[PDB]
């Protein structure tokens, strides 16, 4: 607590120094600093493997003069280094071109008095204490079944951070945060086929984490479930995106409605503002001020206030995700999305995962996807998949070495249901998602 308050003071002073140095030679300036400290450990077969002490610091500045911008950064926060960084950005801004959409965020939108979102829950975890948590997780996985023949280890991470932002409208605000996580990853084998999977727990406070024994049990369960997969034959079939990949399915929306994509006409949703792009029962709620939230933030990366919004309301796209620059390009105002989205929530429609299998009857459950394969400008979708084949509403066998393909516009519009099995460790939180049909490429 005292180490972090010592850092916070230093960081606030660095921001104020940088802004003062910029003020005589620029019309505007924005300064961001951060410091993250903590430990990362791993175990192999229950014995310490790696112990890494982390300490990262950063200062970035953007300056504006005659609507010309320039940026510079440094990990050295000494007064002389700050002076050089400010000068570097000012020098760049002499040579860039005037761009009227560039500039400090609008004063009326800034979080001058930012809310306390209770993100900071420090723990004094020693390296030896950390190793024991990682070892417990890994050992619980390894002891689960005799087909678990190798390991990628246990891991524990615990870090605290401080962030401060200021700009030339007089905003200067900062906040502290923590994040802790525990994982394990093991390898199982059957008839010369190896598979690997993992499990994890994550939270802002140590007392919000699952036990190491829970993590290990989950790891073993997932890994063993992968054994002896089949390569499906090429077909059209319904597809459930399991919760852990369904979040990413909605995640593709972020790029598609980002103001930067919109003003450049490089999104397949360009003509979809106010149109029904999802089912009429589906709402995507954004909750930036959730206490302790994994992606809660009291302001965005330009210092703009973050707001409770329904991005999708009853299937309808209500807004773009705008930053100061993209908002100005479109004749709009920032929506506080510089640096991304801040806790999305999509409610279930009443069915458990088991009930979703029964509703589908026969089809594919995807649990892991590989590759990029998503076109931002057309919505065309083609990704490698692993998961399970379902028939008679029951999982029959794992599958791998297949692809799934379609187009996001059709995929989103025709979602059948979203389950109550909500994934709660992510920014976007939702249950599993049933689509009526995709093209599965295989044998």
């Amino acid at each position: 607590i005292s180490q972090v308050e010592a850092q916070r003071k230093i960081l606030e002073e660095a921001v104020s120094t940088a802004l003062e140095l910029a003020s005589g030679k620029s019309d505007g300036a924005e300064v961001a600093v951060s410091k993250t400290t903590g430990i990362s450990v791993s175990t192999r077969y229950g014995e310490v493997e790696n112990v890494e002490f982390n300490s990262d610091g950063a200062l970035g500045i953007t300056v504006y003069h005659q609507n010309r911008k320039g940026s510079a950064s440094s990990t050295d926060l000494s007064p002389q280094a700050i002076a050089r960084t400010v000068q570097a950005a000012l020098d760049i801004a002499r040579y860039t071109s005037p761009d009227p959409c560039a500039g400090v965020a609008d004063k009326e939108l800034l979080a001058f008095d930012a809310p306390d979102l209770d993100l900071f829950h420090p723990a004094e975890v020693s390296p030896d204490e950390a190793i024991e948590l990682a070892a417990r997780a890994e050992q619980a996985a390894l002891q689960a079944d005799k087909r678990i023949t190798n390991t990628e280890g246990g891991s524990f991470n615990s870090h605290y951070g401080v962030k401060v932002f200021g700009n030339s409208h007089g905003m200067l605000q900062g906040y502290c945060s923590t994040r802790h996580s525990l994982s394990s990853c093991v390898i199982a084998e059957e008839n010369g086929d190896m598979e690997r999977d993992y499990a994890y727990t994550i939270g802002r406070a140590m007392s919000d984490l699952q036990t190491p024994e829970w993590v290990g049990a989950d790891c073993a369960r997932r890994t063993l479930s992968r054994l002896s997969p089949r390569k499906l034959s090429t077909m059209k079939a319904p597809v459930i995106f399991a919760n852990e990949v369904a979040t990413g399915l909605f995640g593709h929306l972020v790029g598609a409605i980002a103001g930067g994509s919109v003003y450049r006409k490089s999104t397949f949703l360009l003509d979809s503002l106010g149109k029904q792009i999802l089912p009429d029962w589906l709402t995507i709620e954004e909750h930036p001020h959730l206490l302790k939230g994994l992606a809660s933030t009291p302001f965005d990366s330009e210092g703009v206030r973050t707001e409770r919004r329904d991005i999708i309301k009853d299937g309808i796209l209500t807004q773009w995700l705008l930053t100061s620059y993209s908002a100005r390009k479109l004749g709009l105002k920032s929506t506080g999305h510089a640096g991304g989205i801040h806790n999305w929530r999509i409610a279930g429609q009443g069915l458990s995962f088991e009930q979703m299998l029964k509703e589908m009857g026969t089809g594919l459950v995807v649990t892991e996807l590989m590759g990029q394969g998503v076109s931002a400008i057309t919505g065309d979708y083609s990704r490698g998949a692993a998961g399970f084949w379902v028939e008679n509403g029951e999982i029959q066998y794992p599958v791998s070495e297949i692809t799934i393909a379609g187009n996001l516009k059709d995929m989103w519009r025709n979602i059948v249901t979203v389950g109550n099995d909500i994934e709660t460790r992510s920014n976007i939180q939702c249950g599993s998602v049933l689509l009526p049909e995709m093209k599965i490429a295989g044998q």
């Binding site: 192999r44 112990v51 911008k69 510079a72 450049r264 990029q372 083609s382 490429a441």
Partner: protein, 480 residues
């Protein structure tokens, strides 16, 4: 390089050789197989043109020291974003806590040896004037817009890095490198009757920006790449649904070498094999690819993005034959994994920065040319795909499944390249796919200088390459 780097990283920060001795000695108080000190300073610049104007520029500086203590499987690691005696002491005292037991303190005397120079030590940031750099971007914009009336947007960026590194270790290694890296990227948007698509080109290497104004087959390189981004965009604009399922795939020369990067490259990194977690573990001497295939990882290529004059452990880059006529010969190593496997360093110990641990990583990974002409390869396919360009890929090294996604592809019908098709992800088993390689072309090339490789959160510059080749059966993730 060593004296010049030593003056910048050590002398300028109040450090001498004898301070290296003292800090290595502090590590060697504990029972360790190895310890090292890694010093780095780097400078990054970027310039971006968009909407016909110089929109943005950045200048980013970092510096620091990383200290490792290693005993068998174990590593302790701490680092600081400054180069000073106190930072080294604090980092060594934290890192060495990996083992409590006392050691004998017997380090090897520090002693540098020569290595072949692979790139200039001339700083690319300072070697060309600011207006001449911006003229490269302006010329890309002009050429791309002039190439076709359907070009509506052009984004062109220039990036440059100048990095100094020095490593000192308990095994006596004392080594330095001076690393330049430049990249030109171009992205264009085309529009016709309300339909829009994008195309990209670019490249670079370990040299100054003058490369982008040098000749490429009778034209200025920047101009040729500007035209290539437009050509790509227009192909994509015309593309129709790709077919779905297992079929023959002919891969073009160059960047389609992503195949090798995913199907065998990561799988042959020594960390996975030492642990036994790779499908290739224990398979040295076995047929893992067709007999037509010789795959190398080559850190020695002058001026190339993926090359390493020394790796981050001070081991000079090497030409490493991984697979020879289909037979697995060995793995890419770092010092840690080489010791545990009873093998030797290969020049593959790489780290993203002083703030990250090294591990076995690729450099330039490519397949040697064969006897077939590209035309003979295409003429051999009754129905399939020709894929001359790709985006990225990904691999599960345990289950041996990999993917890579096309960025330009065509149907082949009756031995002829026909209709352009939309982006598709291709998927296969690494070993099984390599065993399906039935024709290898006589037209090896490497990528233009665009490769980025990610492992354990650490991104590095790499190269890939191959001639044109035929995979007899590969699963194509189309819709049709």
């Amino acid at each position: 390089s060593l004296n010049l780097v030593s003056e910048q990283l050590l002398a300028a920060n109040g450090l001498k050789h004898q301070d290296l001795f003292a800090i290595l000695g502090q590590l060697a108080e504990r029972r360790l197989d190895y310890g090292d000190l890694y010093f780095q300073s780097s400078y990054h610049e970027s310039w971006v043109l968009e909407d016909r104007i110089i929109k943005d520029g950045s200048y980013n500086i970092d510096q620091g020291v990383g200290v490792r203590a290693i005993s068998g499987e174990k590593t302790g690691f701490a680092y600081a974003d400054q180069i000073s005696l106190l930072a080294l002491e604090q980092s060594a005292q934290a890192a060495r806590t990996i083992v409590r037991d006392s050691g004998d303190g017997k380090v090897q005397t520090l002693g540098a040896v020569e290595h072949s120079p692979l790139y200039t030590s001339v700083d690319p940031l300072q070697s060309m004037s600011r207006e001449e750099k911006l003229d490269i971007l302006r010329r890309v914009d002009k050429v791309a817009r002039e190439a076709d009336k359907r070009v509506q947007e052009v984004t062109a960026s220039l990036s440059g890095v100048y990095e100094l590194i020095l490593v000192a270790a308990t095994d006596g290694t004392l080594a330095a490198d001076v690393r330049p890296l430049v990249r030109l990227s171009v992205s264009v948007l085309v529009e016709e009757d309300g339909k829009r698509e994008r195309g990209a080109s670019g490249g670079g290497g370990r040299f100054g920006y003058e490369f982008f104004l040098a000749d490429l087959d009778g034209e200025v390189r920047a101009d040729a790449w500007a035209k290539e981004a437009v050509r790509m965009a227009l192909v994509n604009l015309s593309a129709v649904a790709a077919p779905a399922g297992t079929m023959p795939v002919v891969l073009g020369a160059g960047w389609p070498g992503v195949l090798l990067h995913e199907a065998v490259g990561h799988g042959l990194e020594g960390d996975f094999n030492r642990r036994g977690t790779s499908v290739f573990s224990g398979q040295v001497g076995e047929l893992v690819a067709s007999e037509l295939c010789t795959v190398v990882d080559d850190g020695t290529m002058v001026d190339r993005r993926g090359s390493v004059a020394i790796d981050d452990e001070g081991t000079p880059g090497q030409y490493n034959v991984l697979i020879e006529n289909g037979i697995l010969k060995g793995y890419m190593q770092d010092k840690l994994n080489a010791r545990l496997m009873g093998m030797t360093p290969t020049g593959n110990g790489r780290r993203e920065s002083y703030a990250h641990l090294p591990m076995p990583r690729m450099t330039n990974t490519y397949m040697l040319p064969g006897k077939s002409t590209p035309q003979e390869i295409i003429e051999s396919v009754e129905y399939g795909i020709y894929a001359p360009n790709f985006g990225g890929g990904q691999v599960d090294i345990t289950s041996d499944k990999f993917v890579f996604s096309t960025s330009e592809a065509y149907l082949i019908e009756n031995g002829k390249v026909t209709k352009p098709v939309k982006g598709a992800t291709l998927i296969g088993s690494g070993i099984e796919t390599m065993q399906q390689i039935s024709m290898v072309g006589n037209d090896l090339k490497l990528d233009n200088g665009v490769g980025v490789c990610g492992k354990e959160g650490q991104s590095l510059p790499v190269g890939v390459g191959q001639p044109t080749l035929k995979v007899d059966n590969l699963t194509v993730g189309g819709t049709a």
